[PDB]
Structure formats: structure tokens, C-alpha cells
Amino acid sequence: MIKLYGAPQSAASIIQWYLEELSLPYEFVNVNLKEGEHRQAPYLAINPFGKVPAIADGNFHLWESGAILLYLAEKASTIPADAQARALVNQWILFANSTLANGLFIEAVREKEMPRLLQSLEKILGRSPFILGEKFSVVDVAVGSILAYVPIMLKLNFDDYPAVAAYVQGLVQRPAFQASIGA
Amino acid sequence: MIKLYGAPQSAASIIQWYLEELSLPYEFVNVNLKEGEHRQAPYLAINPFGKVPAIADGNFHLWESGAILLYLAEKASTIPADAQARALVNQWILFANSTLANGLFIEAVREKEMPRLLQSLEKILGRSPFILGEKFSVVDVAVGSILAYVPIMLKLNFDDYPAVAAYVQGLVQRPAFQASIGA
Ligand SMILES: N[C@@H](CCC(=O)N[C@@H](CS)C(=O)NCC(=O)O)C(=O)O
Ligand SMILES: N[C@@H](CCC(=O)N[C@@H](CS)C(=O)NCC(=O)O)C(=O)O
């Protein structure tokens, strides 16, 4: 089965949420970051950059939480997808991991970036229940996790963005979220 | 042909570098950031977050430099046709856009992050000419671009990482790099 390498307060929890949404079994392998287990040869053979999360699926190893989400989304796909459909999912995973995370969590750019990012998402989320439309997808796990860590880590809220706040509340109340990030 | 929306000193030159490597024509469209053209309705209809680069491939619109690089690579038939082969390229594009760019360019984490990132890249680049092995790929455009911007922006060099220095020097001399980022 999928082996997921993680640690507390890492993006491994985001992979755990998507694994809960897909109802896929997996092995959780804790990597002791406090004792530098991630900086030693066995873990460096899984991720040469010494970061969690990572997965092993047989002899296949994969790191970067975003690429793990896209990989799990592809393996669980029923209807074959083309380059454009994968590109729109990849666009949002890249966005969650760079533009969105940086704009919310980098103190020097937050005052400028964060209101703009939330204002743009407010328009999207005010027209559809989820990022890609009516149906929840891996994009909501990627963008939603970054947004949910805003109250958790920044002590900030989404009161000025009612549609963003309702979307984040809805994500937080999903049993798959409560069994993973919410635990 | 692809319409590429860019600006000087943006990641549009990275997309242009890859289009030149693929020998693909493109229509470059400048978005005047200094005059706020990226925050106007026509550009917001291409990228609702008002960032460059973005592409239009007929009626298909796509933003995030990383997703554009992955889409162009898929379209050009340079990645094998399976979820594992795509996940490995995705891993490197996400790494370039998040882990690598943050560790090199964010001052509060550079002291701890940069030597570890460069030491791991040095080991990889000491064993093969390019990140995936013998052949140049979109991974070299994504990772190599970030590395080439280290002297260009931070005034740092790779004197202590010989394989990284030689790799960057080789990338900067490629005709497609000179026709785009080097121009
Ligand atoms: N872009 C990466 C970031 C990974 C990352 O920053 N992981 C941290 C935990 S939050 C880590 O393993 N840090 C250990 C270290 O840098 O020594 C991802 O999304 O997977
Ligand atoms: N993660 C994005 C970053 C894009 C980005 O930050 N673009 C800048 C130019 S370097 C921009 O358009 N900034 C305009 C603004 O922030 O208003 C990507 O790689 O596409």
C-alpha cells in the first residue's frame, strides 16, 4: 500500500485528508525531525532534500505535497483526463504551494497580497460551492488546507470574506477533515 | 500558436525559454505591471489573481508558471504517458516553485535552507549533466531558472558548489536561454 512519510505540523496532514476523502488505506511512517532523522541516508534516499511529506508506492518514491496530491488524484481517476484537464488541476496545486501560501504566510508581503488573494477567491467561491464548481476535488484539499491554516497559525479570520469563511467552515466540518487536519 | 502574457523581470521569460527549447512559435503579449494592466478586467479574465505569466492555447487559458511548464511538456510529448512519470516532473516543478525558491530567496530562512538545498543539488548534479539524467528536460528549465536568478538578484555565487556552478553556466549559454532570459 501507499506509505506516507510525515511528522506533526507538516503538510503530511494534508495528504492524510485527501487519503481520507478517497477512503484509501496507507501506512503512516513518522520521521523524527526533532532528532534529525530526515537528514540521514535512509530518509535522504526517499527525499534527497530531507523534507516531509513523501510517499513510497512499491518501488516508486515521490516528494512535494502538491505532487503527491496530483499523483493520488490521477491514480483514483475513472474518466481518462487530457493535458488541459490535468493542467487546470496542476494550476491550483501550484497556486496553493506558491502564490497563495507566500501571500498569506510571508510577513513582508502579507499586507499587500493577502487581501488581494482573498478578494479574488471571494468572487470565485461566491459563484460556486467549490473551486472547480459543484463538486469537491483535490483542488479544495490544496487551497482549502492553506486557508484553514490561517486561523490555526496566524490568529486571523475571514469575516470580511463571507463566501471564503463559509467555504472554509464547510471544509473543516467534513468528517475526512476532522479525522486528519482537524485531529 | 500559444499566446504568452508576460512582463520584464517575471517568470514569463522562463516559459519563453522552454518554448524556445521546444522550437515552438509563440505570440508574446506584454502586460504593463507598472501601469496596473494586470489588475484590469481583461487580464483578470485570464488570471483572476492578476499575476503573469499566463498562456492562451486557442480558447484554453492557463496561469502559474509551473503548471504552464508541465502543460507545454505534456503537449510536446516529452514525458512518458503514465501517472508516475508525470508525478516525477510535477515533483521537480513544485520543488522549484516552493521549497527551492523559498529557501534561496527568503532572508529569514536562507541561512539554514540555502546550504542544504545547494548541497543536495550538488550531489545530484555531480552524477549527471541534468537533473533527470543525461538529457535536458523541463525540470532543468524550472530548477535551473531559479538557480540562475541567484547571482542575478541576490549577488551570491556558487563557488562552493562546483557542479551547481557548471550546470548554471551551461544553461545560461544555451541558445534558447540567450534568446529569452539572457536577452
Ligand atoms: N513544498 C514542500 C515543503 C516541505 C516542507 O517544508 N517540509 C518541512 C515540514 S513543514 C520539513 O520537512 N522540514 C524539515 C527540514 O527542513 O529540516 C511540500 O509541500 O511538501
Ligand atoms: N507562482 C506564480 C508567481 C507569479 C508572480 O508572482 N508574478 C508577478 C511577477 S514576478 C506578478 O505578476 N506580480 C503582480 C502583482 O503581484 O500585482 C508563478 O510562478 O506563476
Residue numbers in the entry:
A (entry chain B), B (entry chain A): 1 to 183
Relevant lines from the article:
Glutathione transferases (GSTs) constitute a widespread superfamily of enzymes notably involved in detoxification processes and/or in specialized metabolism. In the cyanobacterium Synechocsytis sp. PCC 6803, SynGSTC1, a chi-class GST (GSTC), is thought to participate in the detoxification process of methylglyoxal, a toxic by-product of cellular metabolism. GSTCs were shorter of about 30 residues compared to most cytosolic GSTs and had a well-conserved SRAS motif in the active site (10SRAS13 in SynGSTC1). The crystal structure of SynGSTC1 in complex with glutathione adopted the canonical GST fold with a very open active site because the α4 and α5 helices were exceptionally short.
We also solved the structures of two variants (S10T and R11A variants in complex with GSH) which did not show significant differences from the wild-type. The R11A substitution also did not fully abolish the activity of the enzyme even though it decreased significantly (divided by a factor close to 250 as compared to WT). R11 formed a salt bridge with the N-terminal carboxylate group of GSH in the crystal structure (see above in Section 3.3). The electrostatic influence of R11 on the catalytic process was, however, clear since the catalytic rate was 75 times lower in R11A compared to WT. This was accompanied by a significant one-unit increase in optimal pH suggesting a higher GSH-thiol pKa in the R11A variant than in the WT enzyme. The SynGSTC1 residues with the largest contributions were R11, K51, R116, which formed salt bridges with the GSH negative charges. The arginine residue was invariant, the first position was replaced in a few cases by a threonine residue and the last two positions were a bit more variable.
